[PDB]
């Protein structure tokens, strides 16, 4: 399947996205996994991969995906934000704090990410409160 055009990749992306929307997480994971192998530079594939793993409760695996994603798009707040959610479920408050903090910064610099900026701020405060 190596070397598909951007149109197919785009439609394969749509299928994974839709299966994720449908709660069909294991199927969706498999597609994003495939997309991540086909184009190792497109951050959205790693966002998808991460997301499916999160929903399945595979937090560490989700993190691996989100981390690579963040290197691909240094400005994307969704990566540190959901990374932080995974850290939280795993009982890692420093990771969580560090991700919500970074997500706030990235999100605050981008009007498109306003709602996230506040969720990030709110999660950061909850994490800080838990830490004491």
């Amino acid at each position: 399947l190596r070397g598909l055009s951007e149109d197919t990749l785009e439609q394969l992306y749509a299928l994974g996205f839709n299966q994720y929307q449908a709660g069909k997480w294991d199927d969706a994971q498999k597609i994003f996994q495939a997309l991540c192998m086909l184009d190792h530079y497109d951050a959205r594939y790693f966002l998808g991969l991460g997301a499916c793993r999160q929903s399945l409760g595979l937090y560490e695996q989700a993190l691996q995906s989100y981390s690579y994603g963040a290197l691909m798009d240094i400005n994307e707040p969704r990566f540190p934000f959901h990374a932080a959610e995974c850290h939280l479920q795993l009982g890692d408050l420093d990771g969580a704090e560090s991700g919500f903090y970074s997500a706030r910064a990235l999100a605050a610099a981008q009007p498109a990410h306003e709602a996230l900026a506040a969720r990030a701020g709110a999660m950061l405060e909850a994490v800080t409160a838990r830490k004491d």
Binding site: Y13, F17, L47, A51, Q54, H82
Partner: peptide
């Protein structure tokens, strides 16, 4: 809440 993925084009 899940993750809000970017919609396909």
């Amino acid at each position: 809440t899940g993750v809000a993925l970017t919609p396909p084009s």
